[PDB]
Amino acid sequence: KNPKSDKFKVKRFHHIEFWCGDATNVARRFSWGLGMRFSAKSDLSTGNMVHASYLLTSGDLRFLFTAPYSPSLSAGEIKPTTTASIPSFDHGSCRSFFSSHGLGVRAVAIEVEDAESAFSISVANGAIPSSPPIVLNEAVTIAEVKLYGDVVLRYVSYKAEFLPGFERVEDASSFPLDYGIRRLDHAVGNVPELGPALTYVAGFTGFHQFAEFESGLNSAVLASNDEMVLLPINEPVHGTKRKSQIQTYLEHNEGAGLQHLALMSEDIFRTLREMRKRSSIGGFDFMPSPPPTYYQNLKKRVGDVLSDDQIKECEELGILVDRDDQGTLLQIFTKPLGDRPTIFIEIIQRVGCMMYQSGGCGGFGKGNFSELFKSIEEYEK
Amino acid sequence: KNPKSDKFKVKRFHHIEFWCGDATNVARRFSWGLGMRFSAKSDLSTGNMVHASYLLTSGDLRFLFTAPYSPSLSAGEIKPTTTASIPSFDHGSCRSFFSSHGLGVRAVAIEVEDAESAFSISVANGAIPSSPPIVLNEAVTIAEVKLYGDVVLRYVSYKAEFLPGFERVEDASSFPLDYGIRRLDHAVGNVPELGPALTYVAGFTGFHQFAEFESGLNSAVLASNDEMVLLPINEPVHGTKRKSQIQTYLEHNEGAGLQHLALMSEDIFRTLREMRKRSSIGGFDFMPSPPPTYYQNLKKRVGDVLSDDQIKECEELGILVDRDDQGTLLQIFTKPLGDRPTIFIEIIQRVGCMMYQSGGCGGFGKGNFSELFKSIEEYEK
Numbered sequence: 055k056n057p058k059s060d061k062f063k064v065k066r067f068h069h070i071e072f073w074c075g076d077a078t079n080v081a082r083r084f085s086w087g088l089g090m091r092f093s094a095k096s097d098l099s100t101g102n103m104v105h106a107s108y109l110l111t112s113g114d115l116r117f118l119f120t121a122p123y124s125p126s127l128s129a130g131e132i133k134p135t136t137t138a139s140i141p142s143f144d145h146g147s148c149r150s151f152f153s154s155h156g157l158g159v160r161a162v163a164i165e166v167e168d169a170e171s172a173f174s175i176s177v178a179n180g181a182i183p184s185s186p187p188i189v190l191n192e193a194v195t196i197a198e199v200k201l202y203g204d205v206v207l208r209y210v211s212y213k214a215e216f217l218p219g220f221e222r223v224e225d226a227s228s229f230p231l232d233y234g235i236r237r238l239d240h241a242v243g244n245v246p247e248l249g250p251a252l253t254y255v256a257g258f259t260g261f262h263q264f265a266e267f268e269s270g271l272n273s274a275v276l277a278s279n280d281e282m283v284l285l286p287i288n289e290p291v292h293g294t295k296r297k298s299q300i301q302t303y304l305e306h307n308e309g310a311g312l313q314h315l316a317l318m319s320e321d322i323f324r325t326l327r328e329m330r331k332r333s334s335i336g337g338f339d340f341m342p343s344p345p346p347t348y349y350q351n352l353k354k355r356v357g358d359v360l361s362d363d364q365i366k367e368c369e370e371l372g373i374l375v376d377r378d379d380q381g382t383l384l385q386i387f388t389k390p391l392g393d394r395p396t397i398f399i400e401i402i403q404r405v406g407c408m409m410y411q412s413g414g415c416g417g418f419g420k421g422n423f424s425e426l427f428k429s430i431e432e433y434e435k
Numbered sequence: 436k437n438p439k440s441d442k443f444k445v446k447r448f449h450h451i452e453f454w455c456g457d458a459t460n461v462a463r464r465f466s467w468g469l470g471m472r473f474s475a476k477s478d479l480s481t482g483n484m485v486h487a488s489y490l491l492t493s494g495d496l497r498f499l500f501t502a503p504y505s506p507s508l509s510a511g512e513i514k515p516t517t518t519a520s521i522p523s524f525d526h527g528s529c530r531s532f533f534s535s536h537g538l539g540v541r542a543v544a545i546e547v548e549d550a551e552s553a554f555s556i557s558v559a560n561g562a563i564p565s566s567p568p569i570v571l572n573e574a575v576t577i578a579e580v581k582l583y584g585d586v587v588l589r590y591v592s593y594k595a596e597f598l599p600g601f602e603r604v605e606d607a608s609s610f611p612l613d614y615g616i617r618r619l620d621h622a623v624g625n626v627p628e629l630g631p632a633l634t635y636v637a638g639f640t641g642f643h644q645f646a647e648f649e650s651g652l653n654s655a656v657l658a659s660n661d662e663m664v665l666l667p668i669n670e671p672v673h674g675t676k677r678k679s680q681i682q683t684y685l686e687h688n689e690g691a692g693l694q695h696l697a698l699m700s701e702d703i704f705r706t707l708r709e710m711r712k713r714s715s716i717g718g719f720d721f722m723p724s725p726p727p728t729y730y731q732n733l734k735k736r737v738g739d740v741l742s743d744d745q746i747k748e749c750e751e752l753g754i755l756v757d758r759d760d761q762g763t764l765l766q767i768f769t770k771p772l773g774d775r776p777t778i779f780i781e782i783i784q785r786v787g788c789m790m791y792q793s794g795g796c797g798g799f800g801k802g803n804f805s806e807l808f809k810s811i812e813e814y815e816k
């Protein structure tokens with residue numbers, strides 16, 4: 055059931071912005087590790103005396119890395135005279151965010167028809183304002199409201215190239231890396247209490263609960279009208295044998311924040327080959343692979359969807375597989391992206407639900423908590 | 436002339452420590468960009484609840500990357516009960532350093548016979564204490580005094596593996612990269628006033644001025660007894676046509692600090708091939724190459740030292756060449772290592788001065804200011 059109750063017209067995930075201490079080093083690491091091309095910049099070389107911002111792209115996926123310069127460079131500016139390309143940016147907010155949380159996501163940006171209207175309606179329906187709508191060069195409107203913790207939901211809308219004041223990156227420094235990642239599938243928050251977080255966000259968006267079919271968490275998913283903007287939220291379950299990983303997150307993150315970003319690949323096998331090649335030479339590590347019993351058990355679970363060779367390829371790469379009543383999901387998780395055991399990345403590919411492919415086809419892999427548990431006890435023998 | 440006036444016995448550069456916002460991402464970028472192996476760690480997985488510290492090595496060169504965790508993880512500790520592996524580390528100092536200066540060098544560490552004695556004698560001769568001598572697991576003593584700005588000179592001494600509490604890195608995550616870098620040749624500070632900085636440092640070390648043979652700077656070099664610890668210092672020259680790059684440093688760095696690290700390669704040609712291969716896929720960029728007239732002029736300057744093929748190879752890679760009365764220097768400079776136009780890296784190889792090779796053979800390339808200027812006007816034609 056989908057009541058299509060969005061209170062404003064939402065299109066797609068537009069970008070994810072990381073707040074960094076040094077944007078250069080994070081962006082270059084992420085570019086090599088994920089196969090994303092350097093596409094735009096806003097920094098000293100473009101006249102921005104406030105913040106350094108570098109954009110990586112792979113398909114429709116946009117990762118933005120931003121860090122503050124010394125406030126002294128812009129001490130004479132006021133907001134009417136600012137050289138920042140992102141008017142919501144604040145030196146003090148950025149430094150406090152990074153000191154409190156370490157490296158992580160500041161903004162989940164969705165593209166909307168009308169960012170001023172999206173902001174107004176949101177705030178009229180309980181959203182905590184974070185940055186009022188601002189029109190950039192009469193072409194792009196950007197607005198921000200609080201999502202959870204210190205993460206904002208950012209609305210962007212275009213009259214008709216990333217943002218004004220950003221410049222396309224020079225051909226020489228823009229090496230066309232590509233490991234097959236194409237778009238952001240979903241973005242997941244960790245919170246202390248799922249109920250109040252769900253009520254708040256669903257309250258100002260009109261996003262509906264996405265139908266779902268001892269692990270330390272309860273979770274629910276909010277979705278836009280066409281279920282292409284997907285925002286799951288987790289809360290810890292206390293009192294378990296193994297301490298909840300959601301609670302460990304909240305502790306090391308200093309509270310709520312973005313837990314993982316799930317990136318859709320058009321060929322998860324090639325993506326994982328390419329990423330695993332680079333794990334130990336500057337890229338990303340992956341969680342420990344499931345035992346072979348897990349892949350033995352795949353024949354019964356997904357033998358109508360994956361061949362024996364396609365299953366062996368999953369075993370080669372540590373890929374996980376889960377199933378809805380509608381589709382099949384292949385997924386794998388990286389180790390944390392930075393120093394703290396907080397944010398990580400999920401690579402996914404979905405099979406089925408053709409009409410184009412409907413959002414969320416195959417679910418989010420929650421059946422893999424049980425199957426992993428079973429397979430490890432089965433492998434123990 | 437070398438009076439060998441060291442006030443304590445100094446051995447060699449031991450390591451360079453960067454203070455970071457996220458040590459993971461800087462270290463992984465540096466590892467790939469410079470061909471340095473992950474060798475040791477001190478972090479949550481080793482019981483360190485205070486800071487994440489990752490060590491990269493290439494030959495004798497040691498780069499340490501450190502960032503603070505949330506203070507809440509260690510809120511119950513006191514210095515007698517600390518889990519930090521580096522007792523001088525302070526959350527507030529690290530955050531203030533990084534917020535003020537961005538990514539850069541906090542510690543220039545030299546190995547000495549006796550770090551307690553080195554500290555005491557230093558302070559008795561005017562050094563500003565920064566961290567008193569502390570004995571780690573009865574095996575290693577570490578002490579720190581102020582060098583310039585917020586950079587410390589760190590003394591380390593061993594009774595007889597990097598530091599106690601650091602663990603050797605797992606074979607799988609320790610990929611044996613190597614582009615030919617072997618040791619730190621020199622470490623260079625930028626200051627507002629060269630005279631008072633020279634007097635201070637030479638005053639508490641007994642380091643002597645290293646003999647030297649419109650560019651925007653004045654500089655001098657301090658050296659240990661065998662001239663293997665080399666610490667040049669720059670000050671800006673004001674009132675030039677082109678604004679001094681030293682002054683630009685001081686402005687963007689919020690004052691004095693480490694300007695560049697010069698890394699000796701045992702094969703500068705292979706190092707630069709390997710680094711330039713990776714410039715646009717996560718590694719380091721290099722300053723713009725000199726005009727072809729510069730390499731035409733190399734035949735007259737160094738034709739007795741480099742063949743025509745070895746010169747063409749310099750032109751291929753943008754390598755610079757300078758000459759002492761004693762030796763020849765090949766050098767090249769990276770673009771800034773991070774967001775701000777502050778710290779950069781120099782790759783060098785020295786030819787001559789065999790006895791082993793004496794320190795500083797060939798100088799520091801100050802003749803290349805004139806030769807670059809000449810060659811660009813010559814290329815203009």
Ligand SMILES: Cc1c(C(=O)C2=C(O)C=CCC2=O)ccc2c1c(=O)n(CCc1cccc(Cl)c1)c(=O)n2C
Nearest residue numbers: 242273286288298299314387400418419420422423426
């Ligand atoms: C993130 C994630 C998802 C996911 O995407 C997600 C949503 O998108 C929607 C909300 C529910 C939800 O979880 C699905 C399955 C997962 C994981 C996962 O993170 N992990 C490792 C956990 C782990 C493992 C070992 C020790 C610790 Cl402390 C912790 C798993 O095993 N599975 C099976």
Ligand SMILES: Cc1c(C(=O)C2=C(O)C=CCC2=O)ccc2c1c(=O)n(CCc1cccc(Cl)c1)c(=O)n2C
Nearest residue numbers: 623654667669679680695768781799800801803804807
């Ligand atoms: C760092 C450096 C050295 C060096 O190692 C050093 C010491 O170790 C000892 C003290 C003197 C000293 O300088 C030598 C030569 C250099 C550079 C250099 O940095 N540069 C680029 C500068 C530059 C160029 C263009 C615009 C701007 Cl704003 C700025 C050069 O050209 N040469 C020729």
Ligand SMILES: [Co+2]
Nearest residue numbers: 242316400418
């Ligand atoms: Co997920």
Ligand SMILES: [Co+2]
Nearest residue numbers: 623697781799
């Ligand atoms: Co130098």
